[PDB]
Design a protein around this ligand. Structure first.
Ligand SMILES: Nc1ncnc2c1ncn2[C@@H]1O[C@H](CN(CC[C@H](N)C(=O)O)CC2CN(CCC(c3ccccc3)c3ccccc3)C2)[C@@H](O)[C@H]1O
Ligand SMILES: [Zn+2]
Length: 149
């Protein structure tokens, strides 16, 4: 309804009251909603630093050697968002084969942002999930589960 830049300009405050991080039955911790989220709604930005894809291997190797969890979102074959040090709650979003959210790379005022949108109405208590771009067995539990990430 509202143009994309107008919708993006409001998020930090609204995501603080709309979502929370708790233990997930899918894997480790996940992002869950604290209030009902309308279909199409901008939920949260996957916050972090945009880096070149070639740099990920050494960055992940650095984090792993320090026993620090590595949180990255692959934009595509050339860019990645590193949420390890400068991330927010969106870094805990788990994968699902019947997701209720989807990721989009939006470019507002010359700057790229990965934003998460609701695919359907999401009800309080539900875990927020998106289909990861990509091996590892899937634990989403959906009827139509692809069984791998
Ligand atoms: N549908 C799914 N089915 C099966 N597995 C799934 C599904 N969706 C997501 N995952 C898993 O989550 C990963 C994505 N993840 C999403 C958030 C994650 N739930 C979390 O809690 O961090 C962010 C990455 C996980 N890492 C941190 C790990 C953390 C840890 C390890 C084991 C147990 C608990 C926690 C760790 C912490 C400190 C130091 C070292 C490691 C970043 C996928 O790569 C996959 O492994
Ligand atoms: Zn699945």
């Amino acid at each position: 309804d509202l143009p994309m830049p107008m919708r993006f300009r409001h998020l930090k405050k609204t995501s603080k009251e709309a979502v929370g991080v708790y233990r997930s039955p899918i894997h480790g911790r996940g992002l869950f909603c604290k209030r009902n989220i309308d279909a199409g709604e901008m939920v949260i930005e996957y916050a972090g630093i945009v880096i070149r894809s070639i740099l990920t291997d050494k960055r992940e190797k650095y984090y792993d050697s320090k026993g620090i969890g590595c949180y990255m979102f692959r934009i595509d074959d050339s860019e990645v968002v590193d949420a390890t040090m400068h991330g927010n709650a969106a870094r805990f979003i788990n994968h699902s084969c019947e997701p209720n959210c989807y990721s989009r790379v939006i470019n507002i005022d010359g700057q790229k942002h990965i934003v998460i949108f609701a695919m359907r109405k999401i009800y309080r208590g539900e875990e927020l999930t998106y289909d990861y771009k990509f091996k590892l067995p899937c634990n989403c539990g959906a009827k139509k589960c692809r069984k791998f990430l």
